[PDB]
Amino acid sequence: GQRMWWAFLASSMVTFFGGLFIILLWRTLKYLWTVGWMTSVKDWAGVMISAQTLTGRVLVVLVFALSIGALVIYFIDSSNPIESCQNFYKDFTLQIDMAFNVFFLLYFGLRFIAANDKLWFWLEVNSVVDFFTVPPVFVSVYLNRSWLGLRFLRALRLIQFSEILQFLNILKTSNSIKLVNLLSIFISTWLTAAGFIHLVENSGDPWENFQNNQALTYWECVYLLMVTMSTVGYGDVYAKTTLGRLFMVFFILGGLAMFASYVPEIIELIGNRKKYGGS
Amino acid sequence: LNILKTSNSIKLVNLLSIFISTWLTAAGFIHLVENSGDPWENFQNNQALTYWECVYLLMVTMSTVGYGDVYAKTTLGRLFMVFFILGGLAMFASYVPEIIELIGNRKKYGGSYSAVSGRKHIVVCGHITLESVSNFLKDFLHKDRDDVNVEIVFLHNISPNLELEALFKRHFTQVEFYQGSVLNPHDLARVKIESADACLILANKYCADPDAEDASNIMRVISIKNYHPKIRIITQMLQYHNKAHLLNIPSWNWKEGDDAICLAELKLGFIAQSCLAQGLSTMLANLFSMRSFIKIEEDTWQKYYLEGVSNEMYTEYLSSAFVGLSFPTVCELCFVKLKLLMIAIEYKSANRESRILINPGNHLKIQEGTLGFFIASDAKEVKRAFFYCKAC
Ligand SMILES: CC(C)CCC[C@@H](C)[C@H]1CC[C@H]2[C@@H]3CC=C4C[C@@H](OC(=O)CCC(=O)O)CC[C@]4(C)[C@H]3CC[C@]12C
Ligand SMILES: Oc1ccc(-c2onc(C(F)(F)F)c2-c2ccc(Cl)cc2)c(O)c1
Ligand SMILES: Oc1ccc(-c2onc(C(F)(F)F)c2-c2ccc(Cl)cc2)c(O)c1
Ligand SMILES: Oc1ccc(-c2onc(C(F)(F)F)c2-c2ccc(Cl)cc2)c(O)c1
Ligand SMILES: Oc1ccc(-c2onc(C(F)(F)F)c2-c2ccc(Cl)cc2)c(O)c1
Ligand SMILES: [Ca+2]
Ligand SMILES: [Mg+2]
């Protein structure tokens, strides 16, 4: 049929923007026009969230695994065409994503219960990830026609690793925490930038009726981003469409500092080897 | 317009303005020179560009990236690039990190606490560091104690470092933090002292000059009292000589809901009271650390010692059935029918002054509603004191 790219983004936009509304209204819906069992539920969710008992421990480990699992599914989905159809009652993939997302929905709900202040929790880095990743799979199962767009965000989840390690009582030292946090930030930024370069370029910028496509597979974009960040430069791959160039300009504007700063520190923390240890 | 009063904001605005200005202007010059030709070739080597490509090329060049896509081709353009490099590189590499640093210096632990009905929250303030927090929290939340239902709230004016973040996160359901001070009567409004129950004060034991430490603690007590008179306070002190000043502040009530714990006094007191009999110091000092019973099988002294280490001291009201009896008799009854020991009785006079007696003799009999100290392994066992009739 005709292109249906517009519908998927919209379903998502509705949840995040719509949510801010209801939250603002409820705070402003008072008449003045300015132990409770609810609190027991709050405490139960809170203890379940982090390492407080066996059940919570397995939940955290399972999240740690399924995040990587979804990231793996994303790579397999890369080489497919931009927008086509996959019947839901026949295949095995697009079900593993379904099971992963139904799980992430409950893990998001539990977090939303056990938060002291709703508003700033709602606009938190980990949150918009789920907001922009959970709708499209359901909408796809509704329409039987999926779309690649805005699935690269599914790589951001790695930011959580530090936290979902500390509860497990595994990292209690300054150096280890510093190193893990830095590596997490770095890998996440790199992969997500690669993802964004892939969706805009493979598809045509809409200004000219989608006729400016330049072919590129996800690995190629990884290379373009690494060459640019380190200032090495090369002429092998240069993004051609307008949107790509604009994003490249802004990315270089801020983030080149990230590669000029983090890498020396990561190199310094590793390699502090005590050469004359032993017995 | 009286819109930028502070310091950092001026720096940030000035930098961003100069940067955007020079960037756009360089783009403009490249566009003008390149779209036009050159005089001494009679205008015959023009390269078709639009402003967008030019600004793209400048931002490619300044940040040392480089690319083989677009490059100025006429003499004037190349000369301009040759000169402009010398300034632009230093400009970019000395401005971008500054702008990144100035923005984003955001206090992560702002905000305020909230009050929840049906529970109780306390506050602490003072020498907050890894050792002290670990010890205090370990003793506070230990499982052997009676079922605990409280929350813990910290204050401090130094952002806690990474190592302590581990502890403050690991008890995600029982510990909360708020940066601020204690001398600023706005901060002490954030923590909601006006509905609290107490405010302990950790004091630095291993200080260099003792006097400054206790002076600061004194002023902390002064301020907390200033915000509210009816508060409870429990603090530390370092020499008996300065302890007295705290007696003076107007609302301390030693008779009701207040106290103070020194160190020097208790230190020398333990030593002296042990001078009459060896080891009494250890026997006392082990009664006030929460510990659990252990298994040891080797026939050393360690097993027989840990046998009694994990004992503790608790309090509970008596039973009505024991009023009309004899203190020796009730002691023997407690031990034989309970496997439980008691030391002293709380207070007996029908007067408005409260006095504490230890090991009463045989001229006293129990009145209705009397509290009594006990020593045993766990609080639940101590509670068996509620009633004993029809039990065998
Ligand atoms: C540098 C560190 C952070 C690791 C970087 C990882 C990437 C360099 C690798 C890891 C996983 C790889 C992917 C794993 C599997 C596939 C499927 C593979 O085959 C198919 O898509 C099957 C159909 C076809 O052949 O077109 C194509 C490459 C791709 C996306 C790979 C592209 C390169 C990836 C992203
Ligand atoms: O395969 C594709 C990819 C992007 C678009 C596309 O088209 N127009 C827009 C825009 F931005 F103008 F709204 C976008 C767009 C841009 C950025 C994001 Cl993050 C998501 C979508 C499309 O149509 C088909
Ligand atoms: O569209 C154009 C633009 C510039 C010239 C042009 O031609 N000759 C000269 C020069 F510099 F030699 F005097 C210049 C020139 C160069 C730099 C500046 Cl800032 C201003 C003018 C022209 O002829 C036509
Ligand atoms: O023919 C054109 C039209 C718009 C721009 C253009 O220029 N700047 C921006 C931006 F985004 F920075 F504001 C944009 C822009 C980007 C996306 C959309 Cl959807 C609409 C406009 C351009 O460069 C050339
Ligand atoms: O055929 C030629 C002639 C002059 C130069 C030339 O070389 N250097 C300069 C400079 F920059 F020092 F002035 C110039 C120059 C610049 C502007 C004007 Cl208007 C005239 C000459 C050249 O490179 C090649
Ligand atoms: Ca015990
Ligand atoms: Mg809480």
Residue B122 φ then ψ, to 5°: -120, 180
Residue A145 φ then ψ, to 5°: -130, 110
Ligand 1 centroid to Cα of residue A227, in Å, is 18
CB contact under 8 A, B162 and A174: yes
Q: Does A178 touch chain B (CB under 8 A)?
A: yes
Distance separating alpha carbons of residues B111 and B98, to the nearest angstrom? 27
Distance separating alpha carbons of residues B22 and B59, to the nearest angstrom? 11
Q: Tokens standing for B49?
A: 């560009």
- Cβ-Cβ contacts under 8 Å, B166 against chain A: 166, 171-172, 177
CB contact under 8 A, A174 and B97: no
Kindly report the three-state secondary structure assignment for every residue of B117-186: CCCCEEEEEECCCHHHHHHHHHHHCCCCCCCCCCEEEEEECCCCCHHHHHHHHHCCCCEEEEECCCCCCC
Residue B330 φ then ψ, to 5°: -70, -35
Ligand 2 centroid to Cα of residue A240, in Å, is 16
- Indicate which atom in ligand 5 lies nearest the CA of residue B79: 11
Of A11, A153, A203, A212, best ligand 2 pocket probe by most atoms within 8 Å of the beta carbon: A203
Cβ partners under 8 Å of residue B207, min gap 6: B213, B238
**DSSP state, A158?**
G
Half-sphere exposure of A275 (CA within 13 A, CB side): 1
Kindly report the three-state secondary structure assignment for every residue of chain B: CCCCCCCHHHHHHHHHHHHHHHHHHHHHHHHHHHHCCCHHHCCCCCCCCCHHHHHHHHHHHHCCCCCCCCCCCCHHHHHHHHHHHHHHHHHHHHHHHHHHHHCCCCCCCCCCCCCCCCCCEEEEEECCCHHHHHHHHHHHCCCCCCCCCCEEEEEECCCCCHHHHHHHHHCCCCEEEEECCCCCCCHHHHCCHHHCCCEEEECCCCCCCHHHHHHHHHHHHHHHHHHCCCCCCECECCCHHHHCHHHHCCCCCCCCCCCCECCHHHHHHHHHHHHCCCCHHHHHHHCCCCCCCCCCCCCCHHHHHHHHHCCEEEEEECCHHHCCCEHHHHHHHHHHHHCCEEEEECCCCCCCCCCCEECCCCCCECCCCCEEEEEECCHHHHHHHHCCCCCC
Distance separating alpha carbons of residues B108 and B14, to the nearest angstrom? 26
Beta bridge partners of B272: none
Residue B247: C-alpha distances to residues A157, B184, B213, B232, B251 (Å)? 57, 24, 18, 14, 9
SS3 A214: coil
| Closest alpha carbon to A8 in A140, A179, A100 | A140
| Closest alpha carbon to B244 in B230, B252, B124, B255 | B252
Residue B152 φ then ψ, to 5°: -125, 135
CB contact under 8 A, A172 and B169: no
Cβ partners under 8 Å of residue B294, min gap 6: B306, B309, B310
The approach used to solve this structure was cryo-EM
CA A276 to the chain's CA centroid = 43
Q: Does B116 touch chain A (CB under 8 A)?
A: yes
Residue position matching structure tokens 């506070």:
B140
Residue A118, H or E segment: helix A118-122
- B121-126 vs B199-202, strand pairing mode: parallel
Ligand 5 centroid to Cα of residue B78, in Å, is 11
Which ligand lies nearest to the CA atom of residue B178 in the structure? 7
Q: Is B260 left (phi over 0), alpha (psi -120 to 50) or beta?
A: beta
Distance separating alpha carbons of residues A242 and A211, to the nearest angstrom? 12
Rg over CA atoms, chain A: 22
Task: Write the DSSP string, A48-88.
Answer: HHSSSSHHHHHHHHHHHHHHHHHHHHHHHTTTS-SS-B--T
Distance separating alpha carbons of residues B234 and B260, to the nearest angstrom? 6
Q: Does A166 touch chain B (CB under 8 A)?
A: yes
B25 CB neighbour count, 10 Å cutoff: 11
- Cβ-Cβ contacts under 8 Å, A231 against chain B: 63-65
Q: Is B93 left (phi over 0), alpha (psi -120 to 50) or beta?
A: alpha
Sign for the pseudo-dihedral over CA of B198, B203, B205, B209: negative
**DSSP state, A1?**
-
Å between A228 CA and nearest CA of chain B: 6
Angle between helical axes of A174-202 and A242-253 (0-180°, round to 10): 160
SS3 A209: coil
Å between B205 CA and nearest CA of chain A: 25
CB contact under 8 A, A256 and B68: no
B62 CB neighbour count, 10 Å cutoff: 22
SS3 A210: coil
CB contact under 8 A, B96 and A257: yes
- Chain A residue with CA closest to B93: the answer is A257
Is residue A213 within 8 A of residue A204, CB to CB? The reply is yes
Residue B163 marked ligand-binding: no
CA B170 to the chain's CA centroid = 13
Cβ partners under 8 Å of residue B308, min gap 6: none
Cβ partners under 8 Å of residue A26, min gap 6: none
CB contact under 8 A, A173 and B163: yes
Angle between helical axes of A37-49 and A96-113 (0-180°, round to 10): 130
CB contact under 8 A, A35 and B65: no
SS3 A45: helix
Distance separating alpha carbons of residues B251 and B232, to the nearest angstrom? 10
Long-range Cβ contact pairs of B71-74 (< 8 A, separation 24 or more): B72/B30, B72/B33, B72/B34, B72/B47, B73/B34, B73/B45, B73/B47, B74/B33, B74/B34, B74/B37, B74/B38, B74/B45, B74/B47
Q: Does B3 touch chain A (CB under 8 A)?
A: no
Sign for the pseudo-dihedral over CA of A61, A65, A68, A69: negative
Is residue B161 within 8 A of residue B167, CB to CB? The reply is no
Distance separating alpha carbons of residues A93 and A102, to the nearest angstrom? 15
SS3 A34: coil
CB contacts < 8 A (A, B): 78
- Chain B residue with CA closest to A232: the answer is B65
Resolution (A): 3.9
Distance separating alpha carbons of residues A203 and A215, to the nearest angstrom? 9
Ligand 2 centroid to Cα of residue A109, in Å, is 29
CB contact under 8 A, A253 and B66: no
Burial of B345 (0-12, 13-18, 19+ CB in 10 A): buried
Å between A47 CA and nearest CA of chain B: 6
Distance separating alpha carbons of residues A107 and A123, to the nearest angstrom? 17
- Indicate which atom in ligand 3 lies nearest the CA of residue B43: 23
Å between A262 CA and nearest CA of chain B: 13
- Cβ-Cβ contacts under 8 Å, A39 against chain B: 116-119
Q: Which of B60, B106, B143, B147 to mutate to test the interface with A (most CBs of A within 10 A)?
A: B60
